[PDB]
Design a binder for this molecule. Structure first.
Ligand SMILES: [Zn+2]
Ligand SMILES: [Zn+2]
Length: 115
């Protein structure tokens, strides 16, 4: 019923790791990225599992009012990270890292709305 109180922590944590990866993407420190993109992949991978399980645990319409809406962005983002990792190119990667960071920065307000 009230899983959104731990999903708030997950969104705050997701912003804080995307903030680090953005600095590494602008530094061009690709030997850190080869052992750190796995952690933003895990931020989405955890979200698509926990939000789907939280929808099955839902018992209140207001504490359910954003679960599926945030999940619909995470199901997009987990596929964008695959494309960004297999196109064979990273010319504009930091722009996408910030474009996902800015989306987690709205999810952290939506998940808090009915706390
Ligand atoms: Zn995401
Ligand atoms: Zn999110």
């Amino acid at each position: 019923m009230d899983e959104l109180r731990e999903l708030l922590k997950a969104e705050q944590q997701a912003i804080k790791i995307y903030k680090e990866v953005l600095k590494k993407a602008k530094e061009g420190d690709e030997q850190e990225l080869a052992r750190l993109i796995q952690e933003i992949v895990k931020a989405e991978k955890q979200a698509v599992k926990v939000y789907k399980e939280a929808a099955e645990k839902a018992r209140n319409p207001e504490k359910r009012q954003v679960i599926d809406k945030i999940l619909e962005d995470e199901e997009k983002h987990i596929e964008w990270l695959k494309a960004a990792s297999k196109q064979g190119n990273a010319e504009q990667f930091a722009s996408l890292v910030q474009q996902i960071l800015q989306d987690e920065q709205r999810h952290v307000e939506e998940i808090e709305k009915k706390n």
